[PDB]
Ligand SMILES: [Cl-]
């Protein structure tokens with residue numbers, strides 16, 4: 354098929370956070386039907402970043418979600434034409450980051466192009482002081498809206514010395530495939546874990562791993 | 578012990594939404610350790626309500642959460658003194674609902690006192706026109722913060738014709754008991770399913786059920 358049991362990926366990312374311009378590239382591979390993937394990420398311009406790499410981490414891959422039970426796979430069905438997404442992440446202490454992404458397929462390779470615009474991260478806050486320690490595992494609630502798919506979620510970013518910085522994520526995913534050709538899912542949930550394999554040189558190189566599984570609610574229902 | 582295998586609850590609620598005052602009472606029972614409960618609710622003043630009953634649903638019970646794996650129980654451990662919660666619910670179309678709750682324990686019964694204020698619900702929106710069909714199941718993120726425990730989540734309200742109206746919930750849970758007494762949990766999640774069971778007389782009488790389970794992320 355188009356989405357093989359092993360797929361490779363290449364990513365290009367450009368952006369500004371506050372007033373610092375940067376570029377990253379990455380390459381990796383994963384098991385799209387097992388919901389696992391790895392990316393080796395390099396900061397190739399504007400490094401070392403003067404802000405926590407953590408704020409970029411969710412911007413680096415929806416094709417690699419294991420859809421269990423019923424669920425029609427919005428992202429795998431979108432090929433060969435692919436899909437796009439746009440996200441606004443709003444941090445409770447100030448910081449707002451917009452990310453927009455294009456996912457396409459060429460030569461059997463997934464290609465990601467990402468743009469990033471973050472502003473108002475406080476100068477003395479943990480993001481700009483690089484005092485963060487990764488994301489807590491979480492659950493994204495997915496729901497169909499106008500033939501597209503919407504995601505809503507709160508995430509918690511670990512801080513040096515304990516405690517957390519909280520942010521809200523508001524995401525829209527759009528297929529480039531004509532709506533008549535894809536089966537739309539109902540409401541469902543994606544459990545995911547974002548972790549690092551290795552990092553070096555002040556997060557100038559980061560190897561990042563994700564596990565993700567799409568499911569219905571585990572709880573029993575009195576109506577159905 | 579002081580929170581038994583079966584527990585009855587009584588509730589008193591007062592509020593105003595878009596300038597429409599109302600009062601509700603309820604009674605119910607559940608199994609705190611199994612994370613299940615039912616309430617039978619009556620609108621005793623200002624009924625029938627001119628807004629969707631659904632916007633009130635989350636204001637009617639944290640003692641009835643099944644704590645699995647390791648997780649220390651902030652709520653059960655807070656008795657006999659009980660606890661408070663306070664919440665802002667912000668709807669993506671402009672409605673804001675603030676609630677303040679007191680949970681106490683008296684003669685073996687759980688007693689809830691709730692006060693609610695709702696403003697800015699669009700006059701021709703789904704809430705004021707009663708076009709809503711209940712809440713999707715959802716997961717609340719729980720973490721230690723402030724003077725107690727905080728909760729965050731988004732909830733999705735089903736609308737007639739197949740859409741959803743989204744709102745965010747921001748909650749602070751404060752114990753009335755000395756913080757040195759209770760064991761404080763790390764970051765965890767509460768899967769909930771809140772289900773309407775019955776309504777009668779234009780939602781003047783409503784029966785509501787909840788299933789709730791505390792867990793870490795299960796990958
Ligand atoms: Cl008031």
Ligand SMILES: [Cl-]
Nearest residue numbers: 595699700705
């Ligand atoms: Cl009105």
Ligand SMILES: [Cl-]
Nearest residue numbers: 506507730731
């Ligand atoms: Cl959420």
